[PDB]
Amino acid sequence: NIVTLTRFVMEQGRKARGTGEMTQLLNSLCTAVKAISTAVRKAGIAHLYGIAGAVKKLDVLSNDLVINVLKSSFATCVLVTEEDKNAIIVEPEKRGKYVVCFDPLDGSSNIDCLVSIGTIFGIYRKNSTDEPSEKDALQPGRNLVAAGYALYGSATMLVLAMVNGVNCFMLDPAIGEFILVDRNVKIKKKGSIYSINEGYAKEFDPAITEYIQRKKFPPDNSAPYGARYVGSMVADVHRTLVYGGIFMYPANKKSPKGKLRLLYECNPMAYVMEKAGGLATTGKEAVLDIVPTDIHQRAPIILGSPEDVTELLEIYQKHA
Amino acid sequence: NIVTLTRFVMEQGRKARGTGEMTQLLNSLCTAVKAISTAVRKAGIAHLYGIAGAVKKLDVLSNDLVINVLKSSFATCVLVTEEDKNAIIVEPEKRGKYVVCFDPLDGSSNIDCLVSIGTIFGIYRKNSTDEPSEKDALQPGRNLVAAGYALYGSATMLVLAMVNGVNCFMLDPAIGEFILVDRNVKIKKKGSIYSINEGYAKEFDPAITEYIQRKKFPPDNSAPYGARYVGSMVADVHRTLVYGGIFMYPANKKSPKGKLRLLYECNPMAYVMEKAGGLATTGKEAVLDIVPTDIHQRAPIILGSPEDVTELLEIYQKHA
Amino acid sequence: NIVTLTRFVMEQGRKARGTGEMTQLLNSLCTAVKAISTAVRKAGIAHLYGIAGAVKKLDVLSNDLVINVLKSSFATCVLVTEEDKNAIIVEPEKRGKYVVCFDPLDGSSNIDCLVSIGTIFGIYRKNSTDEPSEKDALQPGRNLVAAGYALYGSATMLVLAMVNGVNCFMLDPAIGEFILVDRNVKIKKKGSIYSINEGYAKEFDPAITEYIQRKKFPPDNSAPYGARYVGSMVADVHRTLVYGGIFMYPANKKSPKGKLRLLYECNPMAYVMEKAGGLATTGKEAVLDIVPTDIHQRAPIILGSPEDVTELLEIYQKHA
Amino acid sequence: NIVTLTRFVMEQGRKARGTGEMTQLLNSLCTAVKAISTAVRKAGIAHLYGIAGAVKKLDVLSNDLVINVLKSSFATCVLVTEEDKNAIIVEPEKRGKYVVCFDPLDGSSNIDCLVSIGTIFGIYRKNSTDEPSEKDALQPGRNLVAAGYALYGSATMLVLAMVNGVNCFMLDPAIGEFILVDRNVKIKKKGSIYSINEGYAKEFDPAITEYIQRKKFPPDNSAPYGARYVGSMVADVHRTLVYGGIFMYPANKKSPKGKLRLLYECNPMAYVMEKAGGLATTGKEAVLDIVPTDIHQRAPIILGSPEDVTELLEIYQKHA
Ligand SMILES: Nc1ncnc2c1ncn2[C@@H]1O[C@H](COP(=O)(O)O)[C@@H](O)[C@H]1O
Ligand SMILES: Nc1ncnc2c1ncn2[C@@H]1O[C@H](COP(=O)(O)O)[C@@H](O)[C@H]1O
Ligand SMILES: Nc1ncnc2c1ncn2[C@@H]1O[C@H](COP(=O)(O)O)[C@@H](O)[C@H]1O
Ligand SMILES: Nc1ncnc2c1ncn2[C@@H]1O[C@H](COP(=O)(O)O)[C@@H](O)[C@H]1O
Ligand SMILES: O=P(O)(O)OC[C@H]1O[C@@](CO)(OP(=O)(O)O)[C@@H](O)[C@@H]1O
Ligand SMILES: O=P(O)(O)OC[C@H]1O[C@@](CO)(OP(=O)(O)O)[C@@H](O)[C@@H]1O
Ligand SMILES: O=P(O)(O)OC[C@H]1O[C@@](CO)(OP(=O)(O)O)[C@@H](O)[C@@H]1O
Ligand SMILES: O=P(O)(O)OC[C@H]1O[C@@](CO)(OP(=O)(O)O)[C@@H](O)[C@@H]1O
Ligand SMILES: [Zn+2]
Ligand SMILES: [Zn+2]
Ligand SMILES: [Zn+2]
Ligand SMILES: [Zn+2]
């Protein structure tokens, strides 16, 4: 009773009576993630180092792989990449109805020191009948059909959230299959870890400043929270999902609108947190309700266990 | 030309005119690290999920692979594991002269959320003419013949430090060969990242507190440091070696002698840092000079780029 | 423009407007073949040999893997295995409409000396509405919906024939995907290799005896045919498919009805040869037209390039 | 306990008190065979089929991997390849004392239909005090220091024969390690399989003809032998070593000096057969005693179980 991702997606497409265009897209996504995972684990590196006698940095190659494999699903009309200034309009022969927003290799500062990196994606349905253009990507994350990420960590995991729930799949690289290892994931209501880059403590607003303080010096004299900040949003959000706690990347003054991008970092991760029973907020509003105006717009985000996120939203409220 | 770890170790053994007993040992570490890497990446997991009809949790397995493959080398007499209450004395039939101190899977809290984990090891030459015992492991780190670690991060890397210097080997998993990618590694003199678990801020001593303060609000008005703390010592020490900066786990009033263990976490990493041109101090003395009195003794450690560690030792001096 | 087997099967199921039950079955088949290929290449063998301190012969395990993965496709009601005396009736919860006939590891005498072995399968649609029983498997191969084989040779290849043609897919074991490498395969009209076990020359009928003779001593004094007989039907039929020539395993007197079994050796391979433009005959009739009476019935078979098979059928005719 | 090939070669080198130059060489063969095995199994093929948007045919690549990884050993002075018109003299900077004769990918006709293929090698110690030349390769096979082959069949196996005997190592591709699975291999005294290309029956001499006749129609009325002929010498010789029997490629009147080459096909396999207790004859003399006069010279060879080869030498004597 092994459920593979291939079996799971097809079963879901059949219960939903899709024409199979969305199933084709998700199957292409699973193929693109396995190919990236293999290049990230450095298979074939001996050839660069001349094992047979005698370039593509991993993020450019992860980008070429997601664009090609997704264009050949015949299921997308618009692609937005973290790595590309403009939205990619798929050629008419290869068009389908979906819009995919992705970060091809997340945790750019973490690539060379070999810490966990990952791929983040969100899928929208084209809501118009005109030529595909950037406009089709500019939808609130509330409109996502599916979103998720693949983590290339000690093992590779693909986490997929759709209307029905969040499920986690582990890649068995011996057979190239993702196996369902966690069905219907729900985040703990309260965690014990907070995750933020405190080197920006000087630019933090008073509510963040107050909340961190409370985590280190708890008023009630319970144990302080542990701190963890891997530096790759994928890696820090996955641990928040699996262990609980809170992850924050607020507006500071170098990034006054936050550093993380809305369509392919914040919205995918916000949708997974909400399908898992957590909250994802800007501090003032829910991330999935923002209507973007630029495909590379930034938003501050705080996401994680609902009691921890509620505790910080109450501090935001008493500072107005 | 492709220098594999097997070619490198055999040539270093030839230069040194060793009998070949330490080359057999280093070759046995290379095999155990490859077998742990494959298990960590979850190859064969489908069989656990019933793919063929019809769990040695990853740290017990890593522990069992290092002890067995190292007894089979005929090169060791005493083995000290993070996982083991007592020193393991190798049966006289497999007995050789080296003492191997190791942490088989570091970053215990990070195993389940799939963040980078790793193996740490230090090798001593047995010095007594007595029967092998715990005592042959209780040598200052200054007496280490070789030390290093394997990081199972986005790719698997082995870093080996011997008298000659520090060399980095990348595993090419397609051929099961460690390839020399970075020779005679030297840490940057000053970095821009500090790494510490700030959840313990209530229990830090005043030189640590003052130092974190200067990193966040620089008195000379230079730019603040970035913060990173993955939570696995191997991953944080490895990013410190490759990018620079400082890593700290001081005594807090929960772990008043520090948390990390001297024989198999602090001494191996101190020895690597020192052969790469950096420092490793308790804040009061050099880690490699401590005379161990217990195989599971703990020590504080501060390590990293020479200028950053020196800056903290200055602050430690204006407070005593 | 890579076509993977997953993309190809789904596209074909959509053009045919299947409910997706056949697509699910073929996706399970692709997962079962990858798992067998990995166990055949001996991944993990170091664990039998005690790498970590401390049974299922490859054909019993290949059998357990095909039965479990096919039962969990929820698409089969009857299974017939080379290795099982009785047909397997799938439990009602897991039932679907298809009947699958398979040889789990072909070339039993070739397993231990490591020569090419393979998996052979044929799929029928249940043509009745009564309880599944052996009767459902007893259909002429003319009724096959899909048939094919996976060869675990120097590389792993899956050859799949359905009404529309024969296509060959190569496993890239680095990502676990089968990639379409040969579309719409057609066998050469005449080949230059004959494949038969000549150690039975004493029991051969006069038409076989005459035909071999003509291959070694050609009347017209052209070049003799080369001989090849790997000993695994999969391996010998695949070379016949790809290079042309003829493969024969006639009735001799130890196997007076031939040695090869009809439902899971002869019919699958006969269907592939006919979709590829070749012939497969008993010598008297076409193999796919035999109506079987026992699920483990044997049939002689001669298959391959049509001019070569016609030349031997003309000799059969002048010996009556 | 797990004996890897790296552990075995290093201990044999220690027993023999070698300087370590032949251990470096055998370790370089183990690495080149792992890299050819991965290429043969087609890992990374998706990249050729455009998975990332945007061939060194397998024998050229195998050739380039053996020469490069062997020059990098600093252990060879002359290399003779099946693929190379002339002997390769290693640059004085990489020059050592051994002469390596090899066939990089044997079974050229079988590469495209994916039947077992393999690598064959023989190592001589250079004997002249002269500048290295073709001449140091022209030594009788009796002067070989080590010989063996790698078979890329259903699993990858390395068979190594040195003075001590023949040992078989299975590649565990999950960890990239060759594991000792069969120690001091001895061929059966009499087998029940004969292997020859009978398509040449018109050109065989009368002792071969008579011998095949006795195998098919036994005069003492014992059971006929089975016939097997894969078509790749490594695969057929390997099945002869493990099951027994006889392998023959006599001179036919197309190849009157035989087809297989003395330095890198016949001598390596003869040396393995002899260390396993079997025979290797041209029909007239022992293969290992022939004095080569050309690095690409051909010889007939008959090899296999002692009683079967002796039976054929008897027939060869009643005809001259
Ligand atoms: N594999 C899938 N699993 C989840 N829901 C899907 C699946 N396939 C399609 N559906 C649902 O059906 C809609 C249209 O399917 P489609 O015709 O394939 O584009 C999708 O946008 C989903 O809401
Ligand atoms: N492979 C090696 N590379 C580095 N130094 C080694 C090597 N092998 C041995 N040596 C040095 O020589 C000493 C004795 O070698 P051994 O006889 O093998 O125990 C060791 O303690 C090292 O200091
Ligand atoms: N993936 C497939 N490719 C080939 N034809 C198929 C495919 N799926 C289904 N069809 C055809 O449609 C019939 C019924 O499909 P199904 O409802 O899935 O059982 C099959 O028996 C085939 O003839
Ligand atoms: N690893 C080895 N195993 C078998 N015998 C070896 C080994 N290494 C060297 N010897 C023997 O010792 C000789 C000289 O060793 P070397 O100094 O390395 O060239 C060789 O020609 C072999 O006969
Ligand atoms: O160094 P800081 O400022 O903390 O930024 C890290 C954040 O930005 C991202 C976005 O791509 O990393 P990075 O810039 O290194 O590429 C996230 O993965 C991560 O959470
Ligand atoms: O949770 P904190 O207290 O920060 O401790 C993490 C430190 O301890 C160690 C030691 O084993 O991790 P862990 O307990 O999770 O196994 C180090 O890897 C790590 O640097
Ligand atoms: O030894 P012979 O009689 O030639 O039989 C081999 C034939 O039978 C099969 C059937 O399973 O092999 P085997 O008995 O060794 O298992 C075929 O793969 C093969 O073509
Ligand atoms: O076709 P025949 O004449 O039987 O020759 C096959 C023999 O020659 C060799 C020598 O290289 O194969 P091939 O030409 O196909 O490369 C051997 O592997 C094999 O045993
Ligand atoms: Zn990012
Ligand atoms: Zn640890
Ligand atoms: Zn069979
Ligand atoms: Zn050859």
PDB file of C-alpha atoms in Angstrom, chain C residues 107-110 229-233 236, chain D residues 228:
ATOM      1  CA  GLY C 107      15.927 -16.049 -18.316  1.00  0.00           C
ATOM      2  CA  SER C 108      15.992 -18.132 -15.123  1.00  0.00           C
ATOM      3  CA  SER C 109      19.153 -20.067 -16.128  1.00  0.00           C
ATOM      4  CA  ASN C 110      20.798 -16.585 -16.778  1.00  0.00           C
ATOM      5  CA  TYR C 229      21.485 -17.368 -28.476  1.00  0.00           C
ATOM      6  CA  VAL C 230      21.712 -15.451 -25.167  1.00  0.00           C
ATOM      7  CA  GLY C 231      19.420 -17.925 -23.364  1.00  0.00           C
ATOM      8  CA  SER C 232      16.853 -15.318 -22.188  1.00  0.00           C
ATOM      9  CA  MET C 233      13.901 -15.035 -24.551  1.00  0.00           C
ATOM     10  CA  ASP C 236      16.987 -12.747 -27.859  1.00  0.00           C
TER      11      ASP C 236
ATOM     12  CA  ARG D 228      24.721 -20.576 -25.402  1.00  0.00           C
TER      13      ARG D 228
END
